[PDB]
Amino acid sequence: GNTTSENGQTEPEKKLELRNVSDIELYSQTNGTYRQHVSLDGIPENTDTYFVKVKSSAFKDVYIPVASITEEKRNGQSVYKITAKAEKLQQELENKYVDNFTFYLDKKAKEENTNFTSFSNLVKAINQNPSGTYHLAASLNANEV
Protein backbone atom coordinates (compact mmCIF):
# COMPACT_ATOMS: atom_id res chain seq x y z
CA GLY A 1 0.00 0.00 0.00
CA ASN A 2 2.81 2.41 -0.87
CA THR A 3 5.30 3.35 -3.59
CA THR A 4 8.38 4.86 -1.92
CA SER A 5 11.74 4.98 -3.70
CA GLU A 6 14.35 7.51 -4.81
CA ASN A 7 15.68 9.15 -7.97
CA GLY A 8 18.36 11.59 -9.07
CA GLN A 9 18.76 14.48 -11.53
CA THR A 10 21.65 14.73 -10.03
CA GLU A 11 23.64 16.47 -12.75
CA PRO A 12 23.81 14.11 -15.76
CA GLU A 13 26.87 13.27 -17.83
CA LYS A 14 27.71 14.91 -21.16
CA LYS A 15 27.93 12.79 -24.30
CA LEU A 16 27.37 13.10 -28.04
CA GLU A 17 23.76 12.61 -29.15
CA LEU A 18 21.95 12.68 -32.49
CA ARG A 19 18.53 14.28 -31.92
CA ASN A 20 16.73 15.16 -35.19
CA VAL A 21 17.74 12.01 -37.19
CA SER A 22 15.44 12.42 -40.25
CA ASP A 23 16.98 9.60 -42.35
CA ILE A 24 19.82 6.99 -42.18
CA GLU A 25 21.78 5.83 -45.27
CA LEU A 26 24.35 3.06 -45.59
CA TYR A 27 27.37 3.21 -47.91
CA SER A 28 30.18 0.78 -48.72
CA GLN A 29 33.73 0.69 -50.08
CA THR A 30 33.82 -2.77 -51.67
CA ASN A 31 34.94 -2.08 -55.26
CA GLY A 32 36.90 1.06 -54.36
CA THR A 33 33.86 3.19 -55.30
CA TYR A 34 31.21 4.24 -52.79
CA ARG A 35 27.59 3.36 -53.48
CA GLN A 36 24.24 3.40 -51.69
CA HIS A 37 23.27 0.09 -50.07
CA VAL A 38 19.72 1.27 -49.53
CA SER A 39 18.27 -2.24 -49.23
CA LEU A 40 18.91 -5.96 -49.81
CA ASP A 41 21.98 -6.40 -47.65
CA GLY A 42 21.41 -10.17 -47.58
CA ILE A 43 23.64 -12.13 -45.24
CA PRO A 44 25.57 -9.75 -42.94
CA GLU A 45 28.94 -8.90 -44.44
CA ASN A 46 32.18 -10.41 -43.18
CA THR A 47 34.29 -7.23 -43.24
CA ASP A 48 33.01 -3.97 -41.73
CA THR A 49 34.16 -1.22 -44.08
CA TYR A 50 30.70 0.37 -44.30
CA PHE A 51 29.94 3.80 -42.87
CA VAL A 52 26.55 5.14 -41.82
CA LYS A 53 25.52 8.60 -43.06
CA VAL A 54 22.80 10.14 -40.88
CA LYS A 55 21.09 13.13 -42.48
CA SER A 56 19.31 15.46 -40.05
CA SER A 57 16.67 18.11 -40.64
CA ALA A 58 18.11 20.35 -37.91
CA PHE A 59 21.85 20.33 -38.67
CA LYS A 60 24.09 18.81 -41.32
CA ASP A 61 24.74 15.12 -41.91
CA VAL A 62 27.17 12.98 -39.90
CA TYR A 63 29.35 10.10 -41.13
CA ILE A 64 30.16 7.42 -38.54
CA PRO A 65 31.87 4.04 -39.09
CA VAL A 66 29.89 0.85 -38.58
CA ALA A 67 30.60 -1.55 -35.72
CA SER A 68 28.26 -4.56 -35.92
CA ILE A 69 25.82 -5.73 -38.60
CA THR A 70 23.53 -8.54 -37.46
CA GLU A 71 20.08 -9.98 -38.19
CA GLU A 72 17.25 -9.69 -35.67
CA LYS A 73 13.63 -10.71 -36.21
CA ARG A 74 11.62 -7.54 -35.65
CA ASN A 75 8.37 -9.41 -36.33
CA GLY A 76 9.72 -12.70 -37.67
CA GLN A 77 11.41 -11.16 -40.71
CA SER A 78 14.92 -10.54 -42.04
CA VAL A 79 15.54 -7.18 -40.36
CA TYR A 80 19.18 -6.11 -40.32
CA LYS A 81 20.12 -4.36 -37.08
CA ILE A 82 23.28 -2.28 -37.50
CA THR A 83 25.17 -0.51 -34.72
CA ALA A 84 27.54 2.46 -35.12
CA LYS A 85 30.81 3.09 -33.21
CA ALA A 86 31.55 6.70 -32.17
CA GLU A 87 33.66 8.02 -29.28
CA LYS A 88 30.57 8.70 -27.10
CA LEU A 89 27.35 8.40 -29.15
CA GLN A 90 24.21 7.93 -26.99
CA GLN A 91 20.94 7.15 -28.82
CA GLU A 92 17.67 7.80 -26.97
CA LEU A 93 16.05 4.60 -28.25
CA GLU A 94 12.65 3.65 -26.78
CA ASN A 95 12.78 6.24 -23.96
CA LYS A 96 16.12 4.79 -22.77
CA TYR A 97 19.72 5.65 -23.59
CA VAL A 98 22.04 3.16 -25.30
CA ASP A 99 25.79 3.72 -25.54
CA ASN A 100 25.80 3.08 -29.31
CA PHE A 101 23.77 4.28 -32.29
CA THR A 102 21.78 1.22 -33.38
CA PHE A 103 19.13 1.23 -36.11
CA TYR A 104 17.18 -1.27 -38.21
CA LEU A 105 17.04 -1.52 -42.03
CA ASP A 106 14.17 -2.97 -44.15
CA LYS A 107 13.40 -5.80 -46.70
CA LYS A 108 15.65 -8.70 -47.98
CA ALA A 109 13.93 -10.85 -50.67
CA LYS A 110 13.23 -9.36 -54.16
CA GLU A 111 9.67 -9.67 -55.61
CA GLU A 112 10.30 -11.00 -59.18
CA ASN A 113 6.50 -11.32 -59.72
CA THR A 114 5.87 -7.57 -59.05
CA ASN A 115 8.36 -5.11 -57.42
CA PHE A 116 5.95 -3.82 -54.70
CA THR A 117 8.70 -3.51 -52.06
CA SER A 118 11.87 -1.91 -53.47
CA PHE A 119 13.23 0.19 -56.39
CA SER A 120 16.22 -2.11 -57.18
CA ASN A 121 13.56 -4.75 -57.89
CA LEU A 122 10.98 -2.40 -59.45
CA VAL A 123 13.27 -1.34 -62.31
CA LYS A 124 14.01 -5.01 -62.97
CA ALA A 125 10.36 -6.09 -62.82
CA ILE A 126 9.03 -3.37 -65.12
CA ASN A 127 11.60 -4.05 -67.86
CA GLN A 128 10.36 -7.64 -68.20
CA ASN A 129 6.79 -6.84 -69.26
CA PRO A 130 5.80 -3.14 -69.18
CA SER A 131 2.12 -3.86 -69.77
CA GLY A 132 0.05 -5.02 -66.81
CA THR A 133 -0.80 -3.69 -63.37
CA TYR A 134 1.60 -2.75 -60.57
CA HIS A 135 1.29 -1.54 -56.98
CA LEU A 136 3.72 -0.20 -54.40
CA ALA A 137 4.07 -1.95 -51.02
CA ALA A 138 5.78 0.96 -49.19
CA SER A 139 7.60 4.23 -49.94
CA LEU A 140 10.60 3.16 -52.08
CA ASN A 141 13.98 4.98 -52.18
CA ALA A 142 15.45 5.33 -55.70
CA ASN A 143 18.97 5.83 -54.24
CA GLU A 144 19.28 2.01 -54.60
CA VAL A 145 19.34 2.16 -58.46
Major β-sheet strand ordering:
3-2-4-5-6-9
Profile the largest sheet: 6 strands, antiparallel
User: What form results from the Cα inertia axes?
Assistant: elongated
The total count of helices amounts to 1
Share of residues in helices: under 10%
Q: Tell me the structural class.
A: mainly beta
The proportion of strand residues reads 25-35%
First and last CA, distance? 62 Å
Please report the total strand number as a whole number: 9
Along the chain, the helix and strand elements come as EEEEEEEEEH
Radius of gyration: 19 Å
Description:
It comes from Streptococcus pneumoniae (strain ATCC BAA-255 / R6). Belongs to the peptidase M26 family. It is found in: Secreted, Cell wall; Membrane. The chain has 1 helix and 9 strands, in the order E-E-E-E-E-E-E-E-E-H. It is mostly beta strands and 145 residues long. Strands 3-2-4-5-6-9 form a 6-stranded antiparallel sheet, with no helix packed on it. Strand 4 (51-55) and strand 5 (62-71) form a beta hairpin. The longest helix is centred in the C-terminal third of the chain and has 10 residues, at 119-128.
